Amino acid sequence: AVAITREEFLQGLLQSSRDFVARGKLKAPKWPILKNLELLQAQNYSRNIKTFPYKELNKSMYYDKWVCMCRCEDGALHFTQLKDSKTITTITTPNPRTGGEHPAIISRGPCNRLLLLYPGNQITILDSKTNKVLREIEVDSANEIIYMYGHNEVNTEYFIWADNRGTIGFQSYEDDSQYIVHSAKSDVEYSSGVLHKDSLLLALYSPDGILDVYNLSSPDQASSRFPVDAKIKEVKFADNGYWMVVECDQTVVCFDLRKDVGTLAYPTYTIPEFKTGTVTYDIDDSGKNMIAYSNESNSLTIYKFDKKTKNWTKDEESALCLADFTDMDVVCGDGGIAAILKTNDSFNIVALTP
Known part of the structure; x- marks a missing residue:
């Protein structure tokens, strides 16, 4: 390939990671007072x-986040992508598989690459x-892959995959070449994952409290388990590079x-109101x-979130009703804040403006 061992x-991963570790360290612009809203688009999705x-590093040294919805009809994949209010586009690409089978996971890679995972790995x-x-x-791998991702800046010859028992590997886009950095455990049973900004740390998790962080650059080093009590719905690595945010059903x-490992950035926050x-x-x-x-x-x-008081408070000046x-x-993005509201098979895109 290009990497023989x-x-x-x-060494190529660590080097590339060190190239970008000092970049993307400026803050995204502060949110303004949002008072108006507009229903932009109602679509169905799978x-x-x-x-x-x-995620893409931009010229202002912070990251853009593209969110995507997929609708799968008759040998075609319909995508709706946006990173803000003014970048909403819908793209139709062909579904390479037989019988219009739906992918289980879709992710993007650099150079307009589209990663489609079908059952059976x-x-x-x-x-x-x-x-x-x-x-x-x-x-x-005997186990189901539950994470697949391609970093836009670091080590861009490979993308990352992980199965539901902790096997983690890199796969070359162009060559038949791959490397395993962590092998299957088993207490575990993961459902999803998320990669850190510097692409050295990978968090694998499941809804029922399991959260394990793996170090991708030192093979088979013991993963660290983070103590979560609770129903996990998403784990995020914040763009500042040192927060690991665990979104639960009614707690943050x-x-x-x-x-x-285990030390909190601030006291656990309860979502008001769950009802x-x-x-x-x-x-x-x-x-x-x-x-x-x-x-x-x-x-x-x-x-x-107020850095001073270390807790979340509601902005009362934002009366947003549908x-x-x-x-x-x-x-x-700098094009405006948007909220994507979803049912179990459709979504509405809502533009929020000052």
């Missing part, structure tokens, strides 16, 4: 298809721009990666801004 690969948000890589098949890949737990109940919410990738929706009152509520949503995502 794992030792050679590990919720069973898990899509990981794609079979991966198809497409060029979303040219509609060509680039790779047909099989991963030899934030770990400080600089200290001993509880159908209130849903989402935190942006800065870990400082939060939007919550209430089905009962059809209202969006904005919370802000259809039964069960989940949501938030985006906030």
Whole structure:
């Protein structure tokens, strides 16, 4: 390939990681007072298809977050992508598989690469721009792959995959070349994962409290287990590089990666109101801004984390009122803040403005 030994690969990973470790260290712009809202788009989608948000370092040294929804019809994949209010586009790419089978996981890679995981650990890589098949890949592992991601800046010759018992490997986009850095355990049983900014730390987790962080650059080093009591719905590595935010059903737990495993950045926060109940919410990738929706009152509520007081408080100046949503995502590029409200098979995109 280009890397002949794992030792050679590990050195390329550390090097590339050190290239970008000092970049992307400026803060995203502070959120303004949001008073208006606009329903931009109502579409159907296939919720069973898990899509990981794609992160890109921008010229202002902070990260853009692209969120994607997929709708799978008759040999075609319909994508809706955005990183803010003005970057909403819908793309149609062909589904390379037989019988219109749905992918289990879809993720992006650099150079317009589209990673499609099908059950049985079979991966198809497409060029979303040219509609060509680039790779047909099989991963030899008895366990189901539950994480797949390609970093946009660090070690961009490979993408990452992980199965539900902790096998972690890298796969070359162009060559039949791969390297395993962690092998299967088993207490565990993971459902998802998330990669740290510097692409050296990978967190694998499950809804029932399990959270293990693996070090990708030192093979088979014991993973660290973080104490969560509680129902995990998402784990995020905040863009500042030292917060690990654990979004639960009605609690927010934030770990400080600089200290001993288990040390919190601030006291655990309870979501008001669960009723509880159908209130849903989402935190942006800065870990400082939060939007919550209430089905009962059809209202969006904005919370802000105060570094001084170390807790979340509601911004009362944001009276946002608007259809039964069960989940949501938030985006906030310089084009405007948008909230993606989701049911179990459709979504509405809501532009929020001052």
